[PDB]
Design a protein around this nucleic acid. Sequence first.
RNA 1: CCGAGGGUAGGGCCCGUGACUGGGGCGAAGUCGUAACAAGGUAGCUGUACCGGAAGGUGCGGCUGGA
RNA 2: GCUAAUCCCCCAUGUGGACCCGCCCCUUGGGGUGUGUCCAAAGGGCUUUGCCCGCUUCCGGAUGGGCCCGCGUCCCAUCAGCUAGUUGGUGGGGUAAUGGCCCACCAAGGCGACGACGGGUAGCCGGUCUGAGAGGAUGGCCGGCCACAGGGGCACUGAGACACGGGCCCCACUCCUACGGGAGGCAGCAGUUAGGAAUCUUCCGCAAUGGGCGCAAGCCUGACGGAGCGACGCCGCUUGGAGGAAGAAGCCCUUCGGGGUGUAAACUCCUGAACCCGGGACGAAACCCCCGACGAGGGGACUGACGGUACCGGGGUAAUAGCGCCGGCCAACUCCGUGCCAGCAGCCGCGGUAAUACGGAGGGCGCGAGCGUUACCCGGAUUCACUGGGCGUAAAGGGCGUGUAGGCGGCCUGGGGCGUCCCAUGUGAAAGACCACGGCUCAACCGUGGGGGAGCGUGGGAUACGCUCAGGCUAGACGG
Lengths: 75, 96, 99, 82, 137, 122, 208
Amino acid sequence: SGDYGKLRDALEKLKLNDAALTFEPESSTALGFGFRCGFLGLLHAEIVQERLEREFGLSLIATAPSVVYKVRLKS
Amino acid sequence: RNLSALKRHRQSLKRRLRNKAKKSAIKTLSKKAIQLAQEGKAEEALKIMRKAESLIDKAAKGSTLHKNAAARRKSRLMRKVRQLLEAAGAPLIGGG
Amino acid sequence: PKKVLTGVVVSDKMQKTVTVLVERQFPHPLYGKVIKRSKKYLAHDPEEKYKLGDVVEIIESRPISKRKRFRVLRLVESGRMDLVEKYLIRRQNYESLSK
Amino acid sequence: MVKIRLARFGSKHNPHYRIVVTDARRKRDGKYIEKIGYYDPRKTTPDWLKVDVERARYWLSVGAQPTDTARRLLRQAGVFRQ
Amino acid sequence: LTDPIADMLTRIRNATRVYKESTDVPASRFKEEILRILAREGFIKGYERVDVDGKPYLRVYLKYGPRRQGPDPRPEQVIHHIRRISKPGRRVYVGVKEIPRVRRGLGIAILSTSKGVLTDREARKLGVGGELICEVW
Amino acid sequence: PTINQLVRKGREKVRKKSKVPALKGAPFRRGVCTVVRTVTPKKPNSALRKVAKVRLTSGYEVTAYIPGEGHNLQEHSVVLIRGGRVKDLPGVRYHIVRGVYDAAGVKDRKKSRSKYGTKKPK
Amino acid sequence: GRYIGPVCRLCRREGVKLYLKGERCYSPKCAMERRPYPPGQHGQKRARRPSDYAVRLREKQKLRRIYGISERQFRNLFEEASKKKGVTGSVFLGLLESRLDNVVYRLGFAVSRRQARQLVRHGHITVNGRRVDLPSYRVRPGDEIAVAEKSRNLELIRQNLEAMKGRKVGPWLSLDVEGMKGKFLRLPDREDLALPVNEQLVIEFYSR
RNA sequence: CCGAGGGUAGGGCCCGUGACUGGGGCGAAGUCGUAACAAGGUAGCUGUACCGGAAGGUGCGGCUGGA
RNA sequence: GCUAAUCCCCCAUGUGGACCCGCCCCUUGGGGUGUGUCCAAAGGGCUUUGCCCGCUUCCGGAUGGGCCCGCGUCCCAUCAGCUAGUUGGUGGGGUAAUGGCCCACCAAGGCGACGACGGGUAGCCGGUCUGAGAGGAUGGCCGGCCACAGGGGCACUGAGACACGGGCCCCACUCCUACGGGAGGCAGCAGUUAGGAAUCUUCCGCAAUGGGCGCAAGCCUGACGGAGCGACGCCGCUUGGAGGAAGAAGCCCUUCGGGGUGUAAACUCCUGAACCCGGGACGAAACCCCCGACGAGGGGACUGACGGUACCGGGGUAAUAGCGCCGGCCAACUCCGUGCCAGCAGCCGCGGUAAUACGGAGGGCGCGAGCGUUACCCGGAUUCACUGGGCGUAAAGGGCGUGUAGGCGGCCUGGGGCGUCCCAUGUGAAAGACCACGGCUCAACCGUGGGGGAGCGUGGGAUACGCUCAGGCUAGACGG
Ligand code: SF4
Ligand SMILES: [Mg+2]
Ligand SMILES: [Mg+2]
Ligand SMILES: [Mg+2]
Ligand SMILES: [Mg+2]
Ligand SMILES: [Mg+2]
Ligand SMILES: [Mg+2]
Ligand SMILES: [Mg+2]
Ligand SMILES: [Mg+2]
Ligand SMILES: [Mg+2]
Ligand SMILES: [Mg+2]
Ligand SMILES: [Mg+2]
Ligand SMILES: [Mg+2]
Ligand SMILES: [Mg+2]
Ligand SMILES: [Mg+2]
Ligand SMILES: [Mg+2]
Ligand SMILES: [Mg+2]
Ligand SMILES: [Mg+2]
Ligand SMILES: [Mg+2]
Ligand SMILES: [Mg+2]
Ligand SMILES: [Mg+2]
Ligand SMILES: [Mg+2]
Ligand SMILES: [Mg+2]
Ligand SMILES: [Mg+2]
Ligand SMILES: [Mg+2]
Ligand SMILES: [Mg+2]
Ligand SMILES: [Mg+2]
Ligand SMILES: [Mg+2]
Ligand SMILES: [Mg+2]
Ligand SMILES: [Mg+2]
Ligand SMILES: [Mg+2]
Ligand SMILES: [Mg+2]
Ligand SMILES: [Mg+2]
Ligand SMILES: [Mg+2]
Ligand SMILES: [Mg+2]
Ligand SMILES: [Mg+2]
Ligand SMILES: [Mg+2]
Ligand SMILES: [Mg+2]
Ligand SMILES: [Mg+2]
Ligand SMILES: [Mg+2]
Ligand SMILES: [Mg+2]
Ligand SMILES: [Mg+2]
Ligand SMILES: [Mg+2]
Ligand SMILES: [Mg+2]
Ligand SMILES: [Mg+2]
Ligand SMILES: [Mg+2]
Ligand SMILES: [Mg+2]
Ligand SMILES: [Mg+2]
Ligand SMILES: [Mg+2]
Ligand SMILES: [Mg+2]
Ligand SMILES: [Mg+2]
Ligand SMILES: [Mg+2]
Ligand SMILES: [Mg+2]
Ligand SMILES: [Mg+2]
Ligand SMILES: [Mg+2]
Ligand SMILES: [Mg+2]
Ligand SMILES: [Mg+2]
Ligand SMILES: [Mg+2]
Ligand SMILES: [Mg+2]
Ligand SMILES: [Mg+2]
Ligand SMILES: [Mg+2]
Ligand SMILES: [Mg+2]
Ligand SMILES: [Mg+2]
Ligand SMILES: [Mg+2]
Ligand SMILES: [Mg+2]
Ligand SMILES: [Mg+2]
Ligand SMILES: [Mg+2]
Ligand SMILES: [Mg+2]
Ligand SMILES: [Mg+2]
Ligand SMILES: [Mg+2]
Ligand SMILES: [Mg+2]
Ligand SMILES: [Mg+2]
Ligand SMILES: [Mg+2]
Ligand SMILES: [Mg+2]
Ligand SMILES: [Mg+2]
Ligand SMILES: [Mg+2]
Ligand SMILES: [Mg+2]
Ligand SMILES: [Mg+2]
Ligand SMILES: [Mg+2]
């Protein structure tokens, strides 16, 4: 952080040649503004992160993913 | 990737040499005259002055020298020479 | 027309040059009051015949040096060292305007 | 050299030229030395071509070269009429 | 005394407001020219030059309207308003095209011109301007 | 002051201060929501006022107001702010613009829809 | 463009006949002869001492609706009257009254001003021989306003024209019935139009 | 010779940022007391000095905007 | 190594011109003259014992430029001292040309509270916006000037450049090699990408106007003329017109009697945006050719990107409406819902279970292809007050003297005539604003004419007041 700029840009700047990649923003107490990413297989995930790291000089961390749990209280 | 601006460049080089060569002679012969005048040697001084006067005014037919460039060259040369001679005098042949 | 101004020689100190202090009057553009303004010109004195206190006329001229482009035209009045004294005091007051 | 030429004024599809003496090197609508007449090529008014004959010959006599369209309009005003 | 003219204007102002018959102003020939106009227009009855302990003064003879009816019978003033324009702090000069029109012509402006001391209307009639001395109405 | 004083010192032009510096000095600015919460107003009002802290393209970070009933913004929402304080929320100098970037229009709005960002319903 | 919409409601609000229809206007069928209180749920409640802004506002709206003009165009004509020399209230009425669609209605080619507008706009009117379909045209002194005769045998114009056989035109106009033509003589004096409008209030409106 | 600039060393100004620190503003219903407004229960205020959790108290002289 | 010329050089002629010296006039290096020296030129087409275009030198003109000077040109004094090519001199160098522009030598000077030096910001003007004016704000488009062409330096060629699409070097960056080296500069037109709240077609045509070259034919011209896209702005125009119930339904309100939407709809009549058919432009008459003489004058033909567009005639269809508001300011009110919640808010303030202030509804007001909002400028703000303000207690008299610069100065005469006033004249470009008229069917827009002033230059005049100089006076001031 806030390499975030160089990350959201890397993602966009690579999607426009990747039919399969999907991303979208999500926040996280640690480590902040990131992206929940859909890949079409584990080897496809390996290749994207290798592009980010090796062609965009990005140091990053793959985590999670987590889901939007809805809650119904009493209201 | 082209032009006739390359032509203008090439031609400019030819003229650069021509102007250089002419202004060199003009400076060399004026100095020689003024050096002869400083020793006087007035016969050879006025002769070289006239070949310097010649070159200067031939340079200003074309582009090497402006009219007023030649006139200022000619003025200062004929004043260096004459005044140097006047310090022991005798102006022999053509010139003043 | 070449400009002609009248002023006082305030400085002699220079070879063939006199400083001619020159004053003018005019209404303030907004507040209308008449105010005075002034400007020192270095004037060409080819015969060092002009000296301190000389109220003179200077004429716009072909440049003689840097920042020297008026020639002294004629003398108008002589020995007005009061005019000079005003100037110098003004300058000397500046010694007390520092930090 | 100096020129007698048309400077376009007017609006879109409404050309109104001033016939104008100016240096050749200015843009056609820029500063001109003198306005010696006008010209409405669509003849939308009775007097669609005025020329101050005296000044035109003065600039003519002094060396100002009329274009071609300006020459024709000057001619058509008998400026060259011997 | 920094402005004699102003002092005359205030000497006349302060006296009329208490309905004096007369008031003295120290003598000067410029002031006479001004008084002369105030006389010539009927803002004052007139003046004479007097001696007050051997010094020269100008006794101005003041003028009012008729005694009025009702509570407060004090007469209307002839000189309602007399005030300096040009002053030692700011001199005020006008060209002939900038002569003001005091109270739509029910008042006057007095000026000093190189053709004499004039009113706004003689100034315009002699085609000259000058220093705007005062307005009176 | 005297005329002379005015000649010596002039009058001072009074120079207006911007209530809206983070715009710098455009009419709107884009940003990413970093915090989205409710805030309470000052006296004499009681409410749970809806608000975002916004990191701007201008480099500023500001708290903006989310007008209208209901909203769809969470942390990391891209947003557009206009000038305009909310008087009950000291610190809130700007309004988010409904219906731009990730900010939905106000749902079921029928009046004043051009504010609140709501298209004319069929 | 122009308003288009119920107009009785307009005359009802202004509290006076604006004669926005021609024929029904002089009938007892008019809502003003019939129910002369402003439209909506509250027309029948008691009034409230109008603010002085409303009195000028309603006076300006009155004069403007009469002629069917936009506020944009009404505002420009008023600005011209003001910037022009001469008493602004009158030059304003003159400038309004010099309108083409208005001179058509005033002449009698149409029963109402909205119709004259359509008459001008549909090509049925000529200024000095040439067809002129612009409703805001500035008719000038000595202009001949006439019916384009390729629509001279038109059932509306004939009817309305025959209705002028007899009726007088304003002291500032002339009309050759069955010539189907008229002149704008001079521009009208304020006394000529008996308008239900204190136009100086309009001046006070726009000087707020 | 001069010369873009590179370099070496030393100054000056400005901006950003900094563990920690100073006080400030603001914030619907926290804690302590009650200094001022009515000889506000020791008339008030005041410049300085010293002291005290806090307002403040006291001294010296001043003001009346207290008798 | 070959070779031509309107390429280069040399000899000649010298109308003239340049330079040194003398002399005359003139007065900064302007003009005339004498002797000495020095300086020119180019050919091409043709119908040919003549014409066309070139060519050399000179003087003058015209135009355009360089340099210099007076005056005006933002913020901070919490920037107060600055200056060694610095200021001047002498002689040189350089240039078209003055100058410390450059250099050598000599002198010790120059500048600054009338703001030097430093910092910050900024292209400047005609104008534009606002304003009662005065003033304030601004410099987009168009016109004028300046500056810059990736960052920096440099000079060459030339009438002119230190040259955006010319050259050289260094740097940053990007791109190509075969490894030696090499390529590039959209702040031209389109266009891409990035940044951004946001800003357009990789269009058409050289028909017009203007430019360059050519004797001309003609060639090139992203100048320009147009077309495209964007309600971005202004102007014009339409979504109909007339009739049509004490008055449908629906919907809202209701004291359930009634009121409202509303002549609004329906429905009758008739007009005819769109669209269809036919026609169909102005802008284009010069260049050129012919007669004459290549001239004046006459006569003649060619040429349209826009565009099969505008526009005209004929036919022809009832045919987009929205947005803001309705507590006060401020034009427009009722019902329901909600219950300090949810929400509104420019200020005042509104919401705590009977809200004209929140949300919806019906009605209403405002404007209408728009309407609102945000940002900013002037106004309202005489709230920086020149016009046009204040200071006992509202903000605001320095703690009190003494005094420097400065500002200001009683009564009388003369000289000057700086301020000031007058008159004449020059300049105040064009566009724009204003008035008048005129052209597009109107208007917007455009054209022609007109009045502009202030300011500044020149010349003439005036002299009351302010000034200056000279001289007085005794009333202010000081002394005895
Ligand atoms: S009818 Fe009566 S109300 Fe309806 S328009 Fe004619 S006048 Fe106005
Ligand atoms: Mg040699
Ligand atoms: Mg010198
Ligand atoms: Mg409350
Ligand atoms: Mg409340
Ligand atoms: Mg709405
Ligand atoms: Mg107004
Ligand atoms: Mg260096
Ligand atoms: Mg280097
Ligand atoms: Mg620090
Ligand atoms: Mg801190
Ligand atoms: Mg106490
Ligand atoms: Mg107490
Ligand atoms: Mg107590
Ligand atoms: Mg007490
Ligand atoms: Mg104490
Ligand atoms: Mg104690
Ligand atoms: Mg005490
Ligand atoms: Mg008390
Ligand atoms: Mg040969
Ligand atoms: Mg020869
Ligand atoms: Mg030196
Ligand atoms: Mg020395
Ligand atoms: Mg000065
Ligand atoms: Mg800049
Ligand atoms: Mg004002
Ligand atoms: Mg701008
Ligand atoms: Mg410009
Ligand atoms: Mg660039
Ligand atoms: Mg470069
Ligand atoms: Mg470069
Ligand atoms: Mg560069
Ligand atoms: Mg050269
Ligand atoms: Mg050339
Ligand atoms: Mg270059
Ligand atoms: Mg070039
Ligand atoms: Mg350059
Ligand atoms: Mg380029
Ligand atoms: Mg481009
Ligand atoms: Mg390229
Ligand atoms: Mg983009
Ligand atoms: Mg972007
Ligand atoms: Mg583009
Ligand atoms: Mg365009
Ligand atoms: Mg062309
Ligand atoms: Mg051409
Ligand atoms: Mg449009
Ligand atoms: Mg009924
Ligand atoms: Mg009903
Ligand atoms: Mg019903
Ligand atoms: Mg009913
Ligand atoms: Mg109807
Ligand atoms: Mg229907
Ligand atoms: Mg039909
Ligand atoms: Mg044509
Ligand atoms: Mg057709
Ligand atoms: Mg509204
Ligand atoms: Mg309003
Ligand atoms: Mg109301
Ligand atoms: Mg609301
Ligand atoms: Mg309720
Ligand atoms: Mg409201
Ligand atoms: Mg409501
Ligand atoms: Mg419109
Ligand atoms: Mg304002
Ligand atoms: Mg007002
Ligand atoms: Mg003001
Ligand atoms: Mg004042
Ligand atoms: Mg005040
Ligand atoms: Mg107080
Ligand atoms: Mg106080
Ligand atoms: Mg005191
Ligand atoms: Mg005090
Ligand atoms: Mg004293
Ligand atoms: Mg003194
Ligand atoms: Mg004095
Ligand atoms: Mg005096
Ligand atoms: Mg004078
Ligand atoms: Mg002009």
